[PDB]
Amino acid sequence: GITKASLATESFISAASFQETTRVLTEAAVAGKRDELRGLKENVIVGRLI
């Protein structure tokens, strides 16, 4: 489904910006995940070139 495929993305900044912010951040914090800023959302956030 849409809502799950969006959250399954490896970019946690894409996931915490969609929904479920409280959960995304904690599961990413415990796995020590690193978002390498792949998609558009991520660069829109950091204020970079798409």
Binding site: L25, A29, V44, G47, I50
Partner: protein, 1341 residues
């Protein structure tokens, strides 16, 4: 037939339904509700009286001392409305209440007569309601909206298939008090009954019964029937009620004294039932196997041993039937529990019930609501008694008890606020009846279950919370306090009661800003019902069922009136003839039909009562005080319409207009408009700014005059007579002897409210609409308001409109207006605007208001005076200083470059900087007024001194005129009394009048009159002085301001904004539009006659919209002007008074069978020519809501003005001169200038202020803010590919602090370079996540 102000201009009415009930006062609910809250009721407690009786007398914890309420009084307000609106203070009255400290002796049982102390104590100032239904809070007229909430009582409800998966309709009950805990009874999937208090946890329903002392045995003998089982010799027998074997299969061979009625496996139909009942069958022999499964009702102990053979509520079997027969029991009682009819619910509930007796239930009930706390017999018993069974913590109120009893089918209507044992059980009984089959749930949306709760009741509620806040401090200080020293006021605090009522008249959702940009907005806003607020719905909690229109609304609430907001079914305007029931439900008038004849006796049927009767509709033709002419009459009953016979008719709708609201009643031809557009039209009619010249509507309904007068904005004659003095400022009318009171002079004064500000910064002026020394009837309009004309409501202007496209300047309802409308300044609006200048106190020092300001050109200081305040009348534009304010500043660190530049010119900044009040950027008008509020003890400006001189001398000439006109009017009567007795006319008037009051007559009834007139003269003489002192005191008095504030100067500007492209206009059928271009007069279309069109509308804005009323309005408006233009021609020609009489007579009696009938033989010559003078602009016509004019009547009227049937004329292009290919619809549509004006809407920003944390631009033109670039707008440039455009808007236009200042410099250097960075809002996200205890760091390249 018609009065003097009606004689000036009669509306031709196309009505045909004679109005048996006239339109009532439209502002009734605001005045009557609050009037209850203040009127000191003697016994039948209401408002403040009820509040005191409820809470007092309050007694101490020792029980030795108590306070008792005696009586309360309202003091006259400190400032009247006039002075409250000015200073900015609440219009409120001192509340002075007598309270008595009664002390008992602790040695004597109740030694009652010990100390009876007494004082009248201050507690708070309650806001008073104005004459017009408003509260002036901090100098703003505010309205408290009536609320619509769920009525208290019992209400049965059911989740259908929301509860559970199977879709078991779980039936439920709710006992809803006015104060106190809720009581819920509800089923479960398995059909066990359950009880929950305040929607807490589920408890078995038999638990509240045990708590009310009900034994297992009593509980079964409330709900279940009895079946007696007789054991005779050996054979088992059963007592039959033949009706009980009903629609059931015979389980054994039913055989009586000697007849087999039903065999095994055979259905017992209605015939088998009447067979047994006719044969009168009482005992039947049955098998032993049949009781196996039956539930024994009572306890059966062994006579022999004395122990339980079987407990009450336990299923018998053959071995239990053996033990019972042998023990010595041959007559067993048993529960009668059918599977479809009489359901075994309580029975299965008792086995789920873990509790045993009364005390076990009370513990379990205590353990739910106070969990964790160890119970005691004191705590368990006390809690349950203080829930539903205490005078204190529980009250259904009169409405609650009444609706409660009427639901349970009771005889008694009034009764106790507390729940009785009977009440709780009766409710459980009815809940089970509903589950069984007889009984249905009540629906909530029914207005019989929706109660109306206006201001007074909600003000009473808050006032009670005030007294309850004090109850704590009374009980506290009574115990601690010495009894001897203590007076009652040392225990009372005034601040909690003041604060709780101020919370309601201030913070509350229902107290809000009066929408007064229009008389109709005032009156329809005061007639408003919101189901939002405390004790009501929320948007979060609002389904669609509450929102939608309900059968019951009919005649109570208007279905065509509600915002198209998120609040779409929640807020509702009240219908025209609608009223609040004595209890609070809604009701509508109805003409009773007795013997089939329609009686003029009217009955206001409540939502409940309406459903019984059959009500004929208003469309049905009466035989003019005979009966219904048609054998079949269309009527409506039990929420539906069908045709009926005439003897079956019970009632009829009173008026044609009753289903509609005040807003919608003013829409002409509403009958031909789609509901959807009609809604917007009535909503926009409220937004219509009143223009410079109040123009009447040519195509009205007739309600215009009811609205304009009831709105309060028009000055009306309290008593009729001759006008003694007429003036722009005021009107003085001398009254006729018959109405005039015998004491006073009998001269009314109306000082008309003059060009004054509204809440929407629009204009309010009252112009005198009667001439010098004119005869006036009581209740006629003496002066017109902002949006009113000869008493009728005038929201906008009517004009020549042609329906035809034009080079796409009327593209999508875009509007093309002639320069001539803008030239006439007729849609030009006045905007009075209030800007304040405050001298405060900073750390560094107090702020000055002088013309001496650092860093200022002579252009700014030119319009200011010596004190530093602008002259009255001075035109000002954005930048110009209105009030010169200067502020202290520390000796700030001057940067060396600044120090050089200050040393270059010499003019170095002083310690005091600057903060002068200057005209807002771009706005501009003329100063009409300045008001100065200085604090008591701060140094006054010389300007302020001029204003005190102006106010004083004006006050002195004002009260001089009061005593002068009143004395002259008073001796005018004495002179007439003196002639009736001792007639010396000419000789008595020669020497001075000052020695007229000594002169008397012989002692008659007329001598007694001379005495009252002479005593009253001195009363006014002595009152003149104490009045002058009050004005002079209030003018010398320092105005007490907010903390830190030394003085405030309020400047009033007057902007005169004329119409331009962007201004929003509309008609009254929801036909919106924006001016696109003002076409010159030379270019506009013109008919063969040569007369240019005012507005060119798009015909394609009609068929989609389905609002045909605008076209009927146009055709009739044309016909009406056609009559005006004929009378205008006859008055210019100067033909004959008899000729004007004939033509106007044929016009007023043109309709097929018109309601109104104007004979012109009654009108004198002078009266006719005043009328013709007003009809020449066009004969105003009235089209009642559903009783409107038909096509035929309109076409007939068109022939009277020598205009085409078609209402389409040959127009010619103004540019070219050649004809348009086809006839074009032209006529007069009453249009309206909406408050959405483009001067306010247009906004622009390059660079500005930034927010504190986010460091992003501000929001709104109020703050001069940038535009919101949302994720919606982000996805658009994402989708295109333009990533630079987006990055621009994400960095250098937004947060990037280096980016924004750097980029501004790039662009002034010419270089359009992207030198970006990272948003500060991300930097914030980092620290906000790190403060959560989450390491978020930037792992780099």
């Amino acid at each position: 037939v018609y009065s003097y102000t009606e004689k000036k201009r009669i509306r031709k009415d196309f009505g045909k339904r004679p109005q048996v009930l006239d339109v009532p006062y439209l502002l009734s609910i605001q005045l009557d509700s609050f009037q209850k809250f203040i009127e000191q009721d003697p016994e039948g407690q209401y408002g403040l009286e009820a509040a005191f009786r409820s809470v007092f007398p309050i007694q101490s914890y020792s029980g030795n001392s108590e306070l008792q309420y005696v009586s309360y009084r309202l003091g006259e307000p400190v400032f009247d409305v006039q002075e409250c609106q000015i200073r900015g203070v609440t219009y409120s009255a001192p509340l002075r209440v007598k309270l008595r400290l009664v002390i008992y002796e602790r040695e004597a049982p109740e030694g009652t007569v010990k100390d009876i102390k007494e004082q009248e104590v201050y507690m708070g100032e309650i806001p008073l309601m104005t004459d017009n239904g408003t509260f002036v809070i901090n100098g703003t007229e505010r309205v408290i909206v009536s609320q619509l909430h769920r009525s208290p009582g019992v209400f049965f409800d059911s989740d259908k298939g929301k509860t559970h998966s199977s879709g078991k309709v779980l039936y439920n009950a709710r006992i809803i008090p006015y104060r106190g805990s809720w009581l819920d009874f509800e089923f479960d999937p398995k059909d066990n009954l359950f009880v929950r208090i305040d929607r807490r946890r589920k408890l078995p329903a038999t638990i509240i019964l045990r708590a009310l002392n009900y034994t297992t045995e009593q509980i079964l003998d409330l709900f279940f029937e009895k079946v007696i089982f007789e054991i005779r010799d050996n054979k088992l027998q059963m007592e039959l009620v033949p009706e009980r074997l009903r629609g059931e299969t015979a389980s054994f061979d039913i055989e009586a004294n000697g007849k087999v009625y039903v065999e095994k496996g055979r259905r017992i139909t209605a015939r088998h039932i009447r067979q047994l009942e006719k044969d009168d069958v009482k005992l039947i022999e049955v098998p032993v196997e049949y009781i196996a499964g039956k539930v024994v009702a009572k306890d059966y102990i062994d006579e022999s041993t004395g122990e339980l053979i079987c407990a009450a509520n336990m299923e018998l079997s053959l071995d239990l039937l053996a033990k019972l027969s042998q023990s010595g029991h041959k007559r067993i009682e048993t529960l009668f529990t059918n599977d479809l009819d009489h359901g075994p619910y309580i029975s299965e509930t008792l086995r789920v019930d873990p509790t045993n007796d009364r005390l076990s239930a009370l513990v379990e009930i205590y353990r739910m609501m106070r969990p964790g706390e160890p119970p005691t017999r004191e705590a368990a018993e006390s809690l349950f008694e203080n829930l539903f069974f205490s005078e204190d913590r529980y009250d259904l109120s009169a409405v609650g008890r009444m609706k409660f009893n009427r639901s349970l089918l009771r005889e008694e209507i009034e009764g106790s606020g507390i729940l009785s044992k009977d009440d709780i059980i009766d409710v459980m009984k009815k809940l089970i009846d509903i589950r069984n089959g007889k009984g249905e749930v009540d629906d909530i949306d029914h207005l019989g279950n929706r109660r109306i709760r206006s201001v007074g009741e909600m003000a009473e509620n808050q006032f009670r919370v005030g007294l309850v806040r004090v109850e704590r401090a009374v009980k506290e200080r009574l115990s601690l306090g010495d009894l001897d020293t203590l007076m009652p006021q040392d225990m009372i605090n005034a601040k909690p009661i003041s604060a709780a009522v101020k919370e309601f008249f201030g913070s509350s959702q229902l107290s809000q800003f009066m929408d007064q940009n229009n008389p109709l907005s005032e009156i329809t806003h005061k007639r408003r019902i919101s189901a939002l607020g405390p004790g009501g719905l929320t948007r979060e909690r609002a389904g669609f069922e509450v929102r939608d229109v309900h059968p019951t609304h009919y005649g109570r609430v208007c279905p065509i009136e509600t915002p198209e907001g998120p609040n779409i079914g929640l807020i509702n305007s009240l219908s025209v003839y609608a009223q609040t029931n004595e209890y609070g439900f809604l009701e509508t008038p109805y003409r009773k039909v007795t013997d089939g004849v329609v009686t003029d006796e009217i009955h206001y049927l409540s939502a409940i009562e309406e459903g019984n009767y059959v009500i004929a509709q208003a469309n049905s033709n009466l035989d003019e005080e005979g009966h219904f002419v048609e054998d079949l009459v269309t009527c409506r009953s039990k929420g539906e319409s069908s045709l009926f016979s005439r003897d079956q008719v019970d009632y009829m709708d009173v008026s044609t207009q009753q289903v509609v609201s005040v807003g919608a009643s003013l829409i002409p031809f509403l009958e031909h408009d789609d509901a959807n557009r009609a809604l917007m039209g009535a909503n926009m009619q409220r937004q219509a700014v009143p223009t410079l010249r109040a123009d009447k509507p040519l195509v009205g309904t007739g309600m215009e005059r009811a609205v304009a007068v009831d709105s309060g904005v028009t000055a009306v004659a309290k008593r009729g007579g001759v006008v003694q003095y007429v003036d722009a400022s005021r009107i003085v009318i001398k009254v006729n002897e018959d109405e005039m009171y015998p004491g006073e002079a009998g001269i009314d004064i109306y000082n008309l409210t003059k060009y004054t500000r509204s809440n929407q910064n629009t204009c309010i002026n009252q112009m005198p609409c009667v001439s010098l020394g004119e005869p006036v009837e009581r209740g006629d309009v003496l002066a017109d308001g902002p949006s009113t004309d000869l008493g009728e409501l005038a929201l906008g202007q009517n004009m020549r409109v042609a329906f035809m496209p034009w080079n796409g300047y009327n593209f999508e309802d875009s509007i093309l207006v002639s320069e001539r409308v803008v030239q006439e300044d007729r849609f030009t609006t006045i905007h009075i605007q209030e800007l304040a200048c405050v001298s405060r106190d900073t750390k560094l020092g107090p702020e000055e208001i002088t013309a001496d300001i650092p860093n200022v050109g002579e252009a700014a200081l030119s319009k200011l005076d010596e004190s530093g305040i602008v002259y009255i009348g001075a035109e000002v534009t954005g930048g110009d200083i209105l009030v010169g304010k200067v502020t202290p500043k520390g000796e700030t660190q001057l940067t060396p470059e600044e120090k050089l530049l200050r040393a270059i010119f010499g003019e170095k900044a002083s310690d005091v900087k600057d903060s002068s009040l200057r005209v807002p950027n771009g706005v501009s008008g003329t100063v009409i007024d300045v008001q100065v509020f200085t604090r008591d003890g701060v140094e006054k400006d010389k300007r302020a001194l001029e204003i005190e001189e102006m106010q004083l001398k004006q006050a002195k000439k004002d009260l001089s005129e009061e005593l002068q006109i009143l004395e002259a009017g008073l001796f005018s009567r004495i002179r007439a009394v003196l002639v009736a007795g001792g007639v010396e006319a000419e000789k008595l008037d020669k020497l001075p009048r000052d020695r007229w009051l000594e002169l008397g007559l012989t002692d008659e009834e007329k001598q007694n009159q001379l005495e009252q007139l002479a005593e009253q003269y001195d009363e006014l003489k002595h009152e003149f002085e104490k009045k002058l002192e009050a004005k002079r005191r209030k003018i010398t008095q320092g105005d007490d301001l907010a903390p830190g504030v030394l003085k405030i100067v309020k400047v009033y500007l007057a902007v005169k904004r004329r119409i331009q492209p962007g201004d929003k206009m509309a008609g009254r059928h929801g036909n919106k539009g924006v001016i696109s271009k003002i076409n010159p007069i030379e270019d506009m279309p013109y008919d063969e006659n040569g007369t240019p069109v005012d507005i060119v509308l798009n015909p394609l804005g009609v068929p989609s919209r389905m609002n045909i009323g605008q076209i009927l309005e146009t055709h009739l408006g044309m016909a009406a002007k056609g009559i005006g233009d004929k009378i205008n021609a006859m008055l210019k020609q100067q033909q004959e008074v008899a000729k004007l009489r004939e033509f106007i007579q044929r016009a007023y009696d043109l309709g097929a069978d018109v309601r109104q009938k104007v004979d012109l033989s009654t009108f004198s010559d002078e009266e006719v020519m005043r009328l013709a003078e007003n009809l020449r602009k066009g004969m105003p016509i009235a089209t009642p809501v559903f009783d409107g004019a038909k096509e035929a009547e309109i076409k007939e009227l068109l022939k009277l003005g020598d205009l085409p049937t078609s209402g389409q004329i040959r127009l010619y292009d103004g540019r070219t001169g050649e004809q348009f290919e086809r006839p074009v619809t032209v006529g007069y549509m009453y249009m309206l200038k909406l408050n959405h004006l483009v001067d306010d809407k247009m906004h622009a920003r390059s660079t500005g202020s930034y927010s504190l944390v986010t460091q992003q631009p501000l929001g709104g033109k109020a703050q001069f803010g940038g535009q919101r670039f949302g994720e919606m707008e982000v996805w658009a440039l994402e989708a295109y590919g333009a990533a630079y455009t987006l990055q621009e808007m994400l960095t250098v236009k937004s947060d990037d602090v280096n980016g924004r200042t750097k980029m501004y410099k790039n662009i002034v250097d010419g270089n359009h370079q992207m030198e970006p960075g990272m948003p500060e809002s991300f930097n914030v996200l980092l620290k906000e996540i790190r403060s959560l205890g989450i390491n978020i760091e930037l792992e780099d390249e």
